[PDB]
Amino acid sequence: DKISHKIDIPDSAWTIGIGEKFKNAGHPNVKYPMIDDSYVQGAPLGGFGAGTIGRTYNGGFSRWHLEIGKNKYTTVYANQFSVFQKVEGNKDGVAQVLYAGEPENGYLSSWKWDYPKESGMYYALYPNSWYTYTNKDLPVQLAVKQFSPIIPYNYKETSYPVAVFKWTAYNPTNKNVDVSIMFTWQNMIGFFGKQVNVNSGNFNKIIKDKSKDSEIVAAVMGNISNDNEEWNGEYSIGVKKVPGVDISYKAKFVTTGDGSDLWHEFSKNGILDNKDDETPTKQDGIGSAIAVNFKLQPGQTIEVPFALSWDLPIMKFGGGDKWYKMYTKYFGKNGKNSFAILKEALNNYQKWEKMIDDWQKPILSNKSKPDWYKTALFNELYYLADGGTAWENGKVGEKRTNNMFGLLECFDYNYYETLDVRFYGSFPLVMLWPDIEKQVMRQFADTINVQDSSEFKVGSNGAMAVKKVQGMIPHDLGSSYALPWIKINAYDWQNPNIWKDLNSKYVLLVYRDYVLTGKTDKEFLKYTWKSVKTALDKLKEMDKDNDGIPDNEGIPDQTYNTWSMKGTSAYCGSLWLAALKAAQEIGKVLKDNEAYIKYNEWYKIAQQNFEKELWNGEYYNFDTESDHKDSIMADQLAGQWYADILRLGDILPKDHVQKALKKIYEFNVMKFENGKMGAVNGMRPDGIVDESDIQAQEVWTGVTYALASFMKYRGMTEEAYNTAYGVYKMTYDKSGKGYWFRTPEAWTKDGNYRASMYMRPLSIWSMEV
Ligand SMILES: [Ca+2]
């Protein structure tokens, strides 16, 4: 490996061998069907709301999130980079697809598949990833840096449906070598969203944009239809000329054939036919190819950028609503703009790399932080793009000021912005894209007084329940299978209108968003204040025994819904105390004296009673009335965690919080698989896991990272990082279970998982407050 020295990969990049088999991978631990796409994954390409494309560490374009809200795992084999090399003095060169695999059927059988093992590495530090190719049959060593312009405090480039592939080639030998790099792509119009005739009318064109010191050559793969539908649009691939390289292309090869129409050209001398052909296809799949060819002398390096763009302007949800995607603000809505997007990337990618470096540098340059922590911090951000992200720029046929946004809980539980989950998972948004975060919270504020009296059948027990109660915050903002933003509370497994935690979490999120954006946004507090007061006032009505605290009912009524809480619980009770303190503070900011006095009075009574009912001398009891009331809960002081972040001070005595956190480390972490897998949710005082429910026996990855941040804030530095380390190890390490770029909600002691590709572990960013 002589190429690494010619590129700059950070030491904290996650690494794996190209073609590496992983032996220890986990699988779903539930009886019901659950997504398991394997460990062959990678960092995604594409901006927020653009649809994303997962290119895996084996080189394949395999995890397709282009249909917003859906996860489709299938390798499109025509989509590849390939290389040709010929040493000066040899009769023949060699050609090789840079993919560690081969097609299942006989399509593309002429291509050289099965990129060999131990011949290159994949690296990832989101939004960047890299491949290096160090192969005994390829005298010239190659590397590529691939990324999309995902940039904090930038709502423009961050939205773009584009990726850049910056190639570096170096000749460490003492002979001249001819080299070609080829990008192939299938015309994927009709891959989704088209009910019949899936390739019909697809056609490919070549664009040559020649100006001074810019030549770009690109293929635009579109359809002859000018219809404005979810399925229609364009893909483009292309390259920018650099000194010392020539460009060749092939506009049309058949992907549903043996591929030799293209490969006989490339494998001879790395130079394509330059054949244009705009003939539309009928049943056959078609694709395009863009190549560069160059000669490298001994010791010579060259850099050449390729790009990929996709203009699919309309997203459609299962309930029928069609919306324009955010990037259409910058490029248009007609679906004929892929070249414009590609050109912007090829002319500006160096600027974008520097913008990414500028945001990563403060963390990467901090030598007090271990590299593993940086690995997790950056790579967990994959989910912001990969989580079915929806970001609208108008309803099809509709202009408003704001652009609604949603991130999925996950794909198995296909709900947008699940409130309980975003209480943990929304840290990167408030910290790095706060205008999005505040928009999402205004969306929630708008729902507070919505009433929908129609009943639905509750999944868990078959009871009928009211859809949406006035004054109760919704569980979620809809599903991609239905009507995101329009039809809320798509979730039906339980009834969230009786939950005792959501209204408090909502209030805490509001005050968080004010505090973490500088305590200056009084207009945001003004917009949300009525909903805050409503939320707390409705919760107060659920105090049955008049101790000042809403009562858990011993039936599903908070996020740990099968792990029953009854009476006053540490979890809901602490969240309540913190929400009351937050609302007092908002009251002072907005000069709402009567609110300040009321919530101060409620707070004083509740705090007193919480302490008497639950403090046992070592930790806070799980609750007052369950059979498992003395369980040590990892999340017992979630309200105090958020109070630290919101700078609300002590809601509980410092000494008791310290004892509680120490107990949690001692038990839930260190007595669970030797502290190497995170914090199990529930443990009995005898040191054995609470077996009263499956949820108690799970580590929740996002709960564990949040607990680590709480420990960190309280000065328990070793315990904080040791606690978080288990989650990193399980996710990314060779000794873990192979969950990179699909971090799940939970695992059990065997390492097997529930709900891969989950929002909650974005909570690692609470460690950066
Ligand atoms: Ca009560």
Numbering used by the authors: 31 to 428, 431 to 801
From the study:
Although no X-ray crystal structure of human GBA2 is available, structures have been solved for Thermoanaerobacterium xylanolyticumTxGH116 β-glucosidase, which shares 37% amino acid sequence identity with human GBA2.8 Instead of hydrolyzing glucosylceramide like GBA2, TxGH116 exhibits high activity toward 4-nitrophenyl β-D-glucopyranoside (4NPGlc), and β-1,3- and β-1,4-linked glucooligosaccharides. The TxGH116 structure contains an N-terminal domain, formed by a two-sheet β-sandwich, tightly associated with a C-terminal (α/α)6 solenoid domain that contains the catalytic nucleophile, E441, and general acid/base, D593, residues, which were verified by chemical rescue of alanine mutants. GH116 enzymes are retaining GHs, as shown for Saccharolobus solfataricus SSO1353 β-glucosidase/β-xylosidase, human GBA2, and TxGH116.6,8,12 In the retaining mechanism, catalysis involves two carboxylic acid/carboxylate side chains with one serving as an acid/base and the other as a nucleophile. Here, we report the structures of Thermoanaerobacterium xylanolyticum β-glucosidase (TxGH116) D593N acid/base mutant in complexes with cellobiose and laminaribiose and its catalytic mechanism.
Indeed, the activities of the D593E, D593G, and D593N mutants were reduced by 36-, 3300-, and 140-fold relative to wild-type for hydrolysis of 4NPGlc, respectively, and in the ranges of 250–900-, 20 000–36 000- and 39 000–44 000-fold for hydrolysis of oligosaccharides. The decreased activities were verified by kinetic analysis of D593A and D593N, which showed ∼30 000-fold decreases in the apparent kcat/Km values relative to wild-type. In all structures, the acid/base residue was mutated to asparagine (D593N) or alanine (D593A). However, the loops of residues 523–534 and 583–597, the last containing the mutated acid/base residue, as well as the side chains of D452 and Q727 in the active site differed from those of wild-type TxGH116. The distance between the catalytic nucleophile E441 and mutated catalytic acid/base N593 in TxGH116 D593N (10.6 Å) was longer than the distance between E441 and the catalytic acid/base D593 in the wild-type TxGH116 structure (8.5 Å).
